[PDB]
Each structure stands twice: as structure tokens, then as C-alpha cells.
């Protein structure tokens, strides 16, 4: 139960009065005009919005099941979820606990630090001799008196949209620029819920744990969030792989999936074997590409003569980006990209921060491939320390749930998992195999 007042040094209660600093109603980048939502600042550059996401996407306002299902293995709907103060308070505490758990690991500490330094580039000027922030990488913090002030941030955790267990990284872009793929980076919004988790089946620990439980095991919420934070990390450094690059599959044969399409960015993020499905020719293609993007940033910093929109000096801002991209500079102040340093930073964000390596640090049971599809959805409550801890997750030490990932076992630790109806029929998406 330690490491509680560490990455998030605030004991927020959802109903606490607004103050305009770390507790305030805010407005985020939006198409039309959105009503202010109550948000919390849990750490430098990071906010949490305990609301269902019905504002980032205009085409996503209805919280009911879509006309067409959603070609996914598992899905869940409930327009009533996350609508009461209690629900929102518990959500705030859940997201916070997961952060502490992630932060309490060395890898987690590194990734969280990399995220905070991953400030979206100040590349919004049309005049190259000036550094200007890009407004979609900010939010407006409304003050108690009704006035407001703008603020930059790198990460926002919001409730899920209609499909409650569809977690993803969303960010706003520029009209001409591709912020997540050009090194600039952009503020990330993550749809996530610490109130539900997936069920998967193990086919392999045994050998090491002959007394492994029987049923399905629950994915540790911390792993799921860390997974999204890895995507967030890529996006903040403008190195996420283009969504168009996906692992095309054959589907004609009777035994083949009717469809799938897992992106390279996804294989990269999971790690393990998955990431090795990508040949070296293409991996080098990606690295060279982003290395050149980093050199562009370096040139842009050297072209800057003035900074607009802040009392912060041009020197400070250049140093901020020197540090983020780990650029080198001469005594003359010139900035450049060191191949070695670029390589380490690129390897760290791409190969060190992976779901699989996180499984290693957490030491929990987890799918060994992105291809081991979830088969169930459960309701959980990780806030009470008697159900889940920052140090052990579900597998509480000095408890009967301590060994063999018993805590993660649905049947054994049944008081912690309630199976919910999957909204994607067992036979919604399928192939008809017939024999004469």
C-alpha cells in the first residue's frame, strides 16, 4: 500500500471545490463548442477527466450500441456508466492507483518521465524565425471567478466512448502537419476505464506453475493502461508508425480469419515475438525516417530568432526541446542530432517501452501475443486495497491469491470479477464450415 503519495501527490475527491489550478472545469480542442467538464491535474502535464468521452469526436455522442456491431472479439455497452459523482470519484481513484502502480516499477518510472518531457513541439508558426505553440496541444482551465487561462499538457485520461472497453489514444492534428508522425508530437487523449478488464485464456505458464488455476484470467488494468501510455509515448515524440502500415492477412481459405488487420504500430507496442514480425528492411526504413524528422526539428530550432506568446525566453524553450529530443549543441549554440543518442532514444521508446517488458516488471499473468484475443469482459473494483494493491495488483502477497496468479484467476478470485455480457455475439462475425 506504499508509493501512494508519489507520482500523484494529491488526495483528490471528485466533489472537491474547483480552484483553477489542479481542480477545474476545462475545455479541450473541439469541433463546435463543448460545455466545460470537471477535470483534475494529477501531475505536471497530466490531467484526468472523469467523464464518458462524448466530445473529442463529433460523430461519437450517442452512448448506445451502434447500428452495426463492431468487428471486435469483445465489446460492452451501458450508457449509464460514469454518470454519478460516486462513479466519477471511484474512476479518479482507480486511474490514480494505476499510475502509482506503473510508477512504482523502474520501467514505469522511465516511461512516465519520458511522457512528461515529451512536450509537443512549438511548431505552429508560419514564420520560421519564430517559435509558437500549437493551440490544439493546450486546454483552457476555467477559474473559480469565471475567467480562464490556457495551459499546455501532454496527456489526458478520459472515460470511454460508447463501447466502454474500447481504449485508445486520440489526438488533434494540424491542417497540413502529421504531428504524431513527424517528431513534433501532440497532446494525447486516452479513453480508458479502470472499472472493467478483459478475460483471456492461458496455455502456457503451467510448466512453471503446475497448480495454475482453471478458468479465464483477468488482464491487469495496469498493463492495459501502460499499453496505452506506450502508444502515447510514441505519439508524443512524433514517431508512431503510420496507421496505414498494417500486417495484411490472407483470408480466402476456410481456416483463415475472415479479417483482422493489426497495425505495425500495434505489433511494435506489444513487443515480444509480435514486434519481430517486422523485417529489418522496414524497421530501418522507419528509423531513418524519424531520424530525418528529428534533424528537421533541429534545423527549425536553429532558425528561431524569437518566441511568441509567452514570458518564457527563447533560450528556455530551445533547451526544453534539446532535452526532449536529446540533441547536441556547440559552444556557439548550434543544435544537431547525434546518431548514437538518436538511436538510444529511439530504441528506448520503441523497444524498451513495450507491453511485454511491463509484464516482466509487474510479474503478472498476461497474453503472450496481441493475437491471443480476449474472450470475456468483467466488472472490477481495484480501489479497495483489499482487492488490489500498487505493489501486487490482484495477486496479494501473504494471501491465498499470492501464488500462481490466483488473484488474476476469475473462478478462484470470484469476489473480484463479475462476468458481463459481451455485446459482440459469439457468432456475429464468423465463417460457415460445412461438411457433406
Amino acid at each position: 500500500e506504499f508509493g501512494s503519495m508519489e507520482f500523484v501527490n494529491k488526495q483528490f475527491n471528485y466533489k472537491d471545490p474547483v480552484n483553477g489550478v489542479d481542480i477545474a472545469y476545462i475545455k479541450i480542442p473541439n469541433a463546435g463548442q463543448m460545455q466545460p467538464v470537471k477535470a483534475f491535474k494529477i501531475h505536471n502535464k497530466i490531467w484526468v477527466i472523469p467523464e464518458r468521452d462524448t466530445f473529442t469526436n463529433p460523430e461519437e455522442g450517442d452512448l448506445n450500441p451502434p447500428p452495426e456491431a463492431k468487428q471486435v472479439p469483445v465489446s460492452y455497452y451501458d450508457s449509464t456508466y460514469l454518470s454519478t459523482d460516486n462513479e466519477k470519484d471511484n474512476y479518479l481513484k482507480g486511474v490514480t492507483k494505476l499510475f502509482e502502480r506503473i510508477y512504482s516499477t523502474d520501467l514505469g518510472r522511465m516511461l512516465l518521465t519520458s511522457i512528461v518531457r515529451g512536450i509537443p513541439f512549438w511548431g505552429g508558426s508560419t514564420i520560421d524565425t519564430e517559435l509558437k505553440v500549437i493551440d490544439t496541444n493546450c486546454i483552457n482551465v476555467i477559474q473559480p471567478d469565471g475567467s480562464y487561462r490556457s495551459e499546455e499538457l501532454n496527456l489526458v485520461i478520459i472515460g470511454p466512448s460508447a463501447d466502454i472497453i474500447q481504449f485508445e489514444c486520440k489526438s488533434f492534428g494540424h491542417e497540413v502537419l502529421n504531428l504524431t508522425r513527424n517528431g513534433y508530437g501532440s497532446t494525447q487523449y486516452i479513453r480508458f476505464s479502470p472499472d472493467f478488464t478483459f478475460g483471456f485464456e492461458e496455455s502456457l505458464e503451467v510448466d512453471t506453475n503446475p497448480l495454475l488455476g482453471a478458468g479465464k484470467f483477468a488482464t491487469d488494468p495496469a498493463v492495459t493502461l501502460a499499453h496505452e501510455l506506450i502508444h502515447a509515448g510514441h505519439r508524443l515524440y512524433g514517431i508512431a508508425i503510420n496507421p496505414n502500415r498494417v500486417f495484411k492477412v490472407n483470408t480466402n481459405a476456410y481456416y483463415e480469419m475472415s479479417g483482422l488487420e493489426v497495425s505495425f504500430e500495434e505489433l511494435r507496442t506489444f513487443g515480444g515475438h509480435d514486434a519481430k514480425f517486422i523485417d529489418s528492411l522496414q524497421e530501418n526504413e522507419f528509423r531513418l525516417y524519424y531520424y530525418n524528422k528529428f534533424k528537421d526539428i533541429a534545423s527549425t530550432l536553429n532558425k528561431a530568432k524569437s518566441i511568441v506568446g509567452t514570458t518564457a525566453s527563447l533560450q528556455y524553450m530551445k533547451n526544453v526541446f534539446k532535452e526532449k529530443y536529446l540533441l547536441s549543441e556547440d559552444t556557439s549554440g548550434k543544435f544537431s542530432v547525434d546518431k548514437l543518442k538518436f538511436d538510444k532514444l529511439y530504441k528506448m521508446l520503441t523497444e524498451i517501452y513495450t507491453e511485454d517488458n511491463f509484464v516482466k516488471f509487474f510479474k503478472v499473468l498476461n497474453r503472450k501475443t496481441y493475437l491471443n484475443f480476449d474472450k470475456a469482459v468483467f466488472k472490477i473494483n481495484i480501489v479497495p486495497k483489499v482487492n488490489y494493491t500498487i505493489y501486487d495488483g490482484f495477486n496479494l502477497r501473504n494471501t491465498n491469491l499470492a501464488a500462481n496468479f490466483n488473484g488474476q484467476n476469475t473462478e478462484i478470485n470470484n469476489m473480484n470479477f463479475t462476468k458481463l455480457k459481451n455485446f459482440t455475439g459469439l457468432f456475429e462475425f464468423y465463417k460457415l464450415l460445412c461438411v457433406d
Binding site: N57, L211, Y255, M257, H273, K276, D436
Partner: protein, 423 residues
């Protein structure tokens, strides 16, 4: 085909199978070695140790500050990143097969854990028809005993023997060294998923020994290694140092080449083969669980047929029963995973790697003649040490470079499988 027996197979329970397009390489690409050829250093693998080194050279203090910026418009106008549009995948596609599939066999081992308490194990896939009849790859004797109506006075003994019978059926294992790289064989896998379409432990073990692991694959992966690109060498008349550097670069470059071919094959093996074995081990686990459930179903039904004698005379605890059968499933899986690990690595080593090694040997041969000719034609520039170099070249290009899986894979359970394989 007038009449048909059909089953709906969930999309997510089907096989992966990457497109050959995802795999590219420029191995056939030639190259010219010079005294300035850039040599790629060895890419250290990711491990808890590397991560440790990264943690130390890490700055935690001083995060960028929350500097003040000038107010933006009260409404920040933005639009989310496009996000490619994926055409909905075709659904409900029908297929007419001339054989029962892995999916049929597996589906045949199911029943609704609802009220219908009259399930009966049996050895024919016609359990696919009757929802009260479950299929089993267990011996026919097992079906006879489990289906048999049992006296309340003989319930517990009956059960105890089924638990043992259950373990006997699933702990089954065969040994051999007539397959190379595959020492054990779980014969019931054949009749459990109808692997190779034979449904007879007997035929199964045979097929495996005959043609190897390929028997398990739902599709034979394709993997070709073109003729490797050759090296051209630049001589530097009267410039010993540059001439030598060229010879060392040509050599160090050959090592990268072997590494490149090895790594490429591992990527293909990993995506096309290993994935298929993984799904198979997941299905075996499903089959085993189906069996445990059916047996528990049958056993519990029997118990509910009694009359209050279930009180003292019995005092049955289905949880303990379930617990014991689960341990048997785990023991079984330990064997299955061992066998499948061997199949996987065996396929990599005997049906894939070989293709690259031959391509690499052709290459070494070429490079060798080349370099020895090189040294000769520059014996005047290298006057101080042609033998030293000749020996170096001969010693290096005469031995193939050892394929070491740990160099490309981290899954410890696959590495040991490789180590065991080495012996």
C-alpha cells in the same frame, strides 16, 4: 452436395496467416567494399540488463516547467487525427469441406452447461448432431465407464477411478528419436483435433515420424532466400592500410550477411509457423477443458439423481473434483507444450534455416575466391603480410557461422528447447 452439416466458427478462433507482402528484404542486392565501408556494430538484445543500463543513464529531476502562455480563444477549434477507414470484413462466408476439421472436432466436444442434464460421452463426431452427446478422443473404455449409471453406494469409488482414468488418458506420452529434434509425441492430439485428417493416435504418431512437424501446420509457409548479393573490392595500390581495411570490412560484412539472413528467417518462422503452433496449443487446452466439463457434467448429474442419501452416504464436493481434473489438465499441457515447442523449433531448424545456410555457403565460396585473388593481386602493396591475411580469410570463410536462436529470440522456453535440441 445436397445435404450439409454446418457449424459457425467465430472469426477470432481462426488462423492468422500473414500475407507474403509483409515480408521484404534486399538480400540479393550487391555491394562494393571499400576501406571506408561502414561496419554495423552488434545490436545488443533487449533484456532486463539493457533496461537496467538505460535506467542509470536517466534524468528524473527537473521536468519541463508549466510556463505561462497567453490565453487562446475561449473555444479551441480542433479535429482529431484522420484515422484510416477499414472496410468491414466480409461475413458469414460458407465453405463445403470433404473432411471434418479441427473446428468440427473441437465443436463436437461441446454441450450447454444449462439444465439439459443427460449428457453422454461418445467416440463419434455425431455428438455434433445431438446436443446431449459430447465427443471424446479418450479410449472407448472411458466412454463406457463414464456413461454407465452408477449406484449411490458406488458413486465415490466410481468418481475416484474416473479422476485416475482421466489423468491416464491425458498424461499419455510417447518417446522416440526417429524424428530428430522431436523426442516426445502426444498421440491423442491426432484424434483430438483430427490433425492431418486421420483421427487415430496410431496413424498420428506414424505421420509425424514420417514427414515431421509439417503435419501440424494448417498451411505450409513459403520462405525463399535469393542468391545473395556479392561483394566487389577496391584495391589501393601502394596503400597497405586501406587495402587491409577493405579485407577486414569484406569479412566483418560477411558476418552481418549471415546475421541478416538468419534474422530474416526467424522473422518469417515467427510470423508464419510459430503462430500456428500457438493456436494449436490453445485449442488443445480448450479440448482438455471440454472433456473435464463433460465428465463433471455427467458425474454431477448422477449425484443429483440420488435421494437425500447424498447427505451422509456421499457428501460430494464437485469443487474438489474440478480441482483434481484441472491439475491433470495442467500436467497434460506441460507435455503438450514441450512437444509443440519441439515441433516449432524443429520446423525452423530443418525446414527453414537450411534454405538460408545453403545460400550463405554459396556466398562464402564466392567471397573466398574473390578475397584470395584480391590478396594475390595486391601482394606487392601488402608485402608485409599476405600469409597473415590469407590465413585469416581461409580460416573465416571455411566455417559456417553457428545459428544461435537466443541471438534472435528471447522466449526462454523456446531457447531451452533449442539448447536441448543442440544435444
Amino acid at each position: 452436395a445436397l445435404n450439409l452439416q454446418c457449424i459457425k466458427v467465430n472469426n477470432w478462433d481462426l488462423f492468422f496467416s500473414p500475407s507474403e507482402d509483409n515480408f521484404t528484404n534486399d538480400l540479393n542486392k550487391g555491394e562494393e567494399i571499400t576501406s571506408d565501408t561502414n561496419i554495423e556494430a552488434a545490436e545488443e538484445n533487449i533484456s532486463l540488463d539493457l533496461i537496467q543500463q538505460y535506467y542509470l543513464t536517466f534524468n528524473f529531476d527537473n521536468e519541463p516547467e508549466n510556463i505561462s502562455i497567453e490565453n487562446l480563444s475561449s473555444d479551441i477549434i480542433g479535429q482529431l487525427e484522420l484515422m484510416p477507414n477499414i472496410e468491414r470484413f466480409p461475413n458469414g462466408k460458407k465453405y463445403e469441406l470433404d473432411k471434418y476439421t479441427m473446428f468440427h472436432y473441437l465443436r463436437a466436444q461441446e454441450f450447454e452447461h444449462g439444465k439439459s442434464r443427460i449428457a453422454l460421452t461418445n467416440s463419434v463426431n455425431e455428438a455434433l448432431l445431438n446436443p446431449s452427446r459430447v465427443y471424446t478422443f479418450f479410449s472407448s473404455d472411458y466412454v463406457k465407464k463414464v456413461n454407465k449409471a452408477t449406484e449411490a453406494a458406488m458413486f465415490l469409488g466410481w468418481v475416484e477411478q474416473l479422476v485416475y482414468d482421466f489423468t491416464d488418458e491425458t498424461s499419455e506420452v510417447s518417446t522416440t528419436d526417429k524424428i530428430a529434434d522431436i523426442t516426445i509425441i502426444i498421440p491423442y492430439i491426432g484424434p483430438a483435433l483430427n490433425i492431418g485428417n486421420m483421427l487415430y493416435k496410431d496413424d498420428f504418431v506414424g505421420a509425424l515420424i514420417f514427414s515431421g512437424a509439417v503435419i501440424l501446420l494448417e498451411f505450409i509457409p513459403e520462405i525463399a532466400i535469393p542468391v545473395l548479393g556479392t561483394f566487389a573490392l577496391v584495391s589501393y595500390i601502394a596503400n597497405k592500410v586501406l587495402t587491409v581495411q577493405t579485407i577486414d570490412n569484406a569479412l566483418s560484412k560477411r558476418n552481418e550477411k549471415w546475421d541478416e539472413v538468419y534474422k530474416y528467417i526467424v522473422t518469417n518462422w515467427l510470423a508464419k509457423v510459430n503462430t500456428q503452433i500457438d493456436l494449436i496449443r490453445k485449442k488443445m487446452k480448450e479440448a482438455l477443458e471440454n472433456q473435464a466439463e463433460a465428465t463433471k457434467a455427467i458425474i454431477n448429474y448422477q449425484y443429483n439423481q440420488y435421494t437425500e442419501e447424498e447427505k451422509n452416504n456421499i457428501n460430494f464436493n464437485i469443487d474438489d473434483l474440478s480441482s483434481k481434473l484441472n491439475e491433470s489438465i495442467n500436467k497434460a499441457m506441460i507435455n503438450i507444450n514441450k512437444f509443440l515447442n519441439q515441433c516449432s523449433v524443429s520446423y525452423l531448424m530443418n525446414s527453414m534455416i537450411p534454405y538460408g545456410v545453403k545460400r550463405l555457403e554459396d556466398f562464402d565460396a564466392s567471397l573466398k575466391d574473390a578475397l584470395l585473388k584480391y590478396i594475390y593481386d595486391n601482394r606487392g602493396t601488402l608485402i608485409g603480410q599476405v600469409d597473415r591475411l590469407k590465413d585469416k580469410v581461409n580460416n573465416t570463410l571455411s566455417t559456417d557461422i553457428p545459428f544461435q536462436l537466443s541471438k534472435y529470440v528471447d522466449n526462454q522456453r523456446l531457447l531451452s528447447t533449442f539448447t536441448e535440441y543442440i544435444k
